[PDB]
N, CA, C and O atoms as a DFTB+ gen file, in Angstrom:
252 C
 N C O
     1  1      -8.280     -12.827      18.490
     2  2      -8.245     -13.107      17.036
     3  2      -6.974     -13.820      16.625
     4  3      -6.612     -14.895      17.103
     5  1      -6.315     -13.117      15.679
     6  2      -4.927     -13.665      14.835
     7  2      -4.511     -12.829      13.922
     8  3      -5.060     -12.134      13.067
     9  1      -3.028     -13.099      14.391
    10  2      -2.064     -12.032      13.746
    11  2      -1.020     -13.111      12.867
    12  3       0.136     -13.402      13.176
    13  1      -1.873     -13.645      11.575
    14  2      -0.382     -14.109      10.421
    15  2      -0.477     -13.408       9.884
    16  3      -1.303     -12.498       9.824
    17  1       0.804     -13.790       9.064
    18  2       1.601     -12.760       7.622
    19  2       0.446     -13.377       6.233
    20  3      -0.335     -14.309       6.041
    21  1       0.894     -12.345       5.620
    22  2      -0.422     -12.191       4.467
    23  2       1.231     -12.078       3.064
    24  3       2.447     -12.271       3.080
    25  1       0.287     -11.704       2.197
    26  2       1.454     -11.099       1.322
    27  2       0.788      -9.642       0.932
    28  3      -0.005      -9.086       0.173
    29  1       2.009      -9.379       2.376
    30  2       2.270      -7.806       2.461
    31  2       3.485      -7.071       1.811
    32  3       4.433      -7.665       1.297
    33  1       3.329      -5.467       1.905
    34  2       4.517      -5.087       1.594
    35  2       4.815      -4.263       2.933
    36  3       4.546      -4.393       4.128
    37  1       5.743      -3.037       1.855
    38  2       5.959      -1.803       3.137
    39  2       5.702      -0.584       2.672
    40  3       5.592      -0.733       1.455
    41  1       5.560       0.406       2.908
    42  2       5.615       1.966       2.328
    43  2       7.206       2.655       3.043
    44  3       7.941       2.405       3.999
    45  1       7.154       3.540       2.017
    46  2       8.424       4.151       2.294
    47  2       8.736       5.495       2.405
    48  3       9.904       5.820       2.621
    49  1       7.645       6.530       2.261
    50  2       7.444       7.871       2.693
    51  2       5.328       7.403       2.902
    52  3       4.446       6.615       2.562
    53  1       5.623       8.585       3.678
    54  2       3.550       9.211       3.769
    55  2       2.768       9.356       2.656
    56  3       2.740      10.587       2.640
    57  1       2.388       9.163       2.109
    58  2       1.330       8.946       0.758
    59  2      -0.140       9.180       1.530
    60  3      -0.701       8.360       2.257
    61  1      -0.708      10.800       1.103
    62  2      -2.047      10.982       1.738
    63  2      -3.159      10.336       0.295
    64  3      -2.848      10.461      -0.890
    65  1      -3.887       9.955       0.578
    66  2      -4.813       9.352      -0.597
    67  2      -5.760      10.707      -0.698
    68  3      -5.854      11.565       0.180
    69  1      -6.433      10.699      -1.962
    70  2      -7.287      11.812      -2.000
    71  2      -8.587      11.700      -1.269
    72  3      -9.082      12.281      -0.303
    73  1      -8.962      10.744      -2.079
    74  2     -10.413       9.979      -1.241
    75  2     -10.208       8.277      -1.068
    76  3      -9.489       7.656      -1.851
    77  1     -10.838       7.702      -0.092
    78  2     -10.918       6.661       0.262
    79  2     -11.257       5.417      -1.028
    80  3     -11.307       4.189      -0.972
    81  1     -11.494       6.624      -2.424
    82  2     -11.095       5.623      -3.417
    83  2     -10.238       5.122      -3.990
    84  3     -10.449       4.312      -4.893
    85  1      -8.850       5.545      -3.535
    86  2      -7.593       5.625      -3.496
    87  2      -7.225       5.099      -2.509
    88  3      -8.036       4.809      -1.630
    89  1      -5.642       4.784      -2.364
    90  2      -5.582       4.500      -0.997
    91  2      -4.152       4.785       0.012
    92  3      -3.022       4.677      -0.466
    93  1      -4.309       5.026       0.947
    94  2      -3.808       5.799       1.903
    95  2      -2.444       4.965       2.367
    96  3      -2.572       3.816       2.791
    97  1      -1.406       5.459       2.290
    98  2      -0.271       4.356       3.292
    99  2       0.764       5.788       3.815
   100  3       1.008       6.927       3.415
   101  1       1.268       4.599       5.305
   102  2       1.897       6.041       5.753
   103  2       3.518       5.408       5.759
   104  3       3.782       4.361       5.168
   105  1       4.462       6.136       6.450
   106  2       6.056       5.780       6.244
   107  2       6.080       4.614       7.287
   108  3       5.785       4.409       8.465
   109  1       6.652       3.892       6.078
   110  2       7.311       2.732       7.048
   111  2       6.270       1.483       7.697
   112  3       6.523       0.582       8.497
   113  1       4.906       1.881       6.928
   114  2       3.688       0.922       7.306
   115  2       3.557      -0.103       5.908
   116  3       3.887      -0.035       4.724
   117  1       2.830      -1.137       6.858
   118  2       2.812      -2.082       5.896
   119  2       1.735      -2.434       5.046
   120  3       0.737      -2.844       5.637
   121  1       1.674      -2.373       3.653
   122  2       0.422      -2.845       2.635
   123  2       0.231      -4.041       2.162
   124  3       1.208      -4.786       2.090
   125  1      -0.982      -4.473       1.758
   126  2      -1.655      -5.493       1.325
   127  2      -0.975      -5.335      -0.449
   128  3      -1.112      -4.383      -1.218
   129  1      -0.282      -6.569      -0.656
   130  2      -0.082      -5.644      -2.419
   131  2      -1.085      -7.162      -3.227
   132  3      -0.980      -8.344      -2.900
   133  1      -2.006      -6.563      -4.327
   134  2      -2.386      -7.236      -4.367
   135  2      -2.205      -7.281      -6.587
   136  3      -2.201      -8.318      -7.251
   137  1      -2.112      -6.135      -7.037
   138  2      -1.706      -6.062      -8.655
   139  2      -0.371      -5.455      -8.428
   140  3      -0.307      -4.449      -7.722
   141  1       0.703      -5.961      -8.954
   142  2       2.230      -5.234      -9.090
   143  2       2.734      -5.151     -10.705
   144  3       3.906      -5.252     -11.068
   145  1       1.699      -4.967     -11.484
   146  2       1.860      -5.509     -13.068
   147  2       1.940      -3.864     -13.539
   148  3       2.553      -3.521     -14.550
   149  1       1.179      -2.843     -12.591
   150  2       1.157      -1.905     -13.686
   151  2       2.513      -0.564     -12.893
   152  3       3.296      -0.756     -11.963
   153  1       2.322       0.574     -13.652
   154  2       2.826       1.764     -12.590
   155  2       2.459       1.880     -10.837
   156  3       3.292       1.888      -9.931
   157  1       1.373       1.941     -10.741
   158  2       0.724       2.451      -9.395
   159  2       0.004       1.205      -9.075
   160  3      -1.019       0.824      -9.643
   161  1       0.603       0.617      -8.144
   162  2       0.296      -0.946      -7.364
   163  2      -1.155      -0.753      -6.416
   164  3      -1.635       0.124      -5.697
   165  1      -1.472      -1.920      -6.811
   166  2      -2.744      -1.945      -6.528
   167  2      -2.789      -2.472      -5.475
   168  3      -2.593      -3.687      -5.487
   169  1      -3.045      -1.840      -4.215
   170  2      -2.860      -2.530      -2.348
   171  2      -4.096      -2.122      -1.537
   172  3      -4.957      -1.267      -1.744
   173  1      -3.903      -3.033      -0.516
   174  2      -5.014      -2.245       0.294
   175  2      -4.467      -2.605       1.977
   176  3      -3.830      -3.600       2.321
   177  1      -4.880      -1.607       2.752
   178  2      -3.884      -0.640       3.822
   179  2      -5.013      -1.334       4.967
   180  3      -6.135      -1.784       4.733
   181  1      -4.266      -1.242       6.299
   182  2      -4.595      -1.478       7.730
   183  2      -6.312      -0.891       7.840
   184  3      -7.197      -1.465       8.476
   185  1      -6.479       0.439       7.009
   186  2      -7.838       0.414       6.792
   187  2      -9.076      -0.072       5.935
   188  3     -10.096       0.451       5.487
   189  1      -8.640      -1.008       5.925
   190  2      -9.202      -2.025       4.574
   191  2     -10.206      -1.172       3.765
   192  3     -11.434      -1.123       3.825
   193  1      -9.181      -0.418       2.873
   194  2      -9.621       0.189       1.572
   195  2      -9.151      -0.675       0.509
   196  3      -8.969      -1.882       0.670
   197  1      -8.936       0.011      -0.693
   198  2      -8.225      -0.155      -1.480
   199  2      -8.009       0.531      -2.674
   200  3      -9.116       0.813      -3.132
   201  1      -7.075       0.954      -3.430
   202  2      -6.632       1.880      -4.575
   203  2      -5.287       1.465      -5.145
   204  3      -4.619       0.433      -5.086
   205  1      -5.152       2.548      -5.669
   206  2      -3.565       2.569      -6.026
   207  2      -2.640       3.576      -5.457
   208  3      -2.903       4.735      -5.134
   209  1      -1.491       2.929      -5.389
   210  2      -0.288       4.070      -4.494
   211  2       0.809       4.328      -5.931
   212  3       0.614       3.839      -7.044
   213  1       2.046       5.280      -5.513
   214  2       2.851       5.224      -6.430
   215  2       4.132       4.879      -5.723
   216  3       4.582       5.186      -4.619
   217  1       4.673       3.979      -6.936
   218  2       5.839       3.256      -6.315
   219  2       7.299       4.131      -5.860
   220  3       8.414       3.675      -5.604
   221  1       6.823       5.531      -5.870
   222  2       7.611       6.542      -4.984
   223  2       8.193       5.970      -3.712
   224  3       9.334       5.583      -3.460
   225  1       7.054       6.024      -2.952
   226  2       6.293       6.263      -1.751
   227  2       6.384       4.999      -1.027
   228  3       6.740       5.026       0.151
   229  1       6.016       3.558      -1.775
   230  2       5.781       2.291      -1.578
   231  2       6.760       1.126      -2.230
   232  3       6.981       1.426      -3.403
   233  1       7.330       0.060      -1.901
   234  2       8.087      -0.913      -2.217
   235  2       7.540      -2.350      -1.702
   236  3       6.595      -2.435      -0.918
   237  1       8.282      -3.550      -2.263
   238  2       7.809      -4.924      -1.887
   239  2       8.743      -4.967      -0.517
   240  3       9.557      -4.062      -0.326
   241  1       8.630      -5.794       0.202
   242  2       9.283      -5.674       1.719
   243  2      10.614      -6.687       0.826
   244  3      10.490      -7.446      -0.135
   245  1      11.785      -6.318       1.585
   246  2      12.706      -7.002       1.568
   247  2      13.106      -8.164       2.203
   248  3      14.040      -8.847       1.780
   249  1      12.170      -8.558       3.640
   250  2      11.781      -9.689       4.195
   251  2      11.082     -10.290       3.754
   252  3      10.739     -11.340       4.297
């Protein structure tokens, strides 16, 4: 296949999602960010879900 860069982020502690309508990121893994307008960013994770996380937990990558 193929491995490019997307516009990703990173997570920054474990964030368990409740249900898969939400969405799941773990420490130090990287997210899909795709709304950054409100509180709880709207991404979607290595398991191609998607929800919202809280910006606790999750940040934009510094790279």
């Amino acid at each position: 296949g193929s491995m490019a860069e997307e516009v990703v982020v990173v997570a920054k502690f474990d964030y368990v999602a409740q249900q898969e309508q939400e969405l799941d990121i773990k420490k130090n893994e990287r997210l899909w960010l795709l709304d950054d307008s409100k509180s709880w960013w709207r991404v979607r994770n290595s398991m191609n879900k998607t929800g919202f996380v809280p910006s606790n937990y999750v940040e934009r990558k510094n790279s």
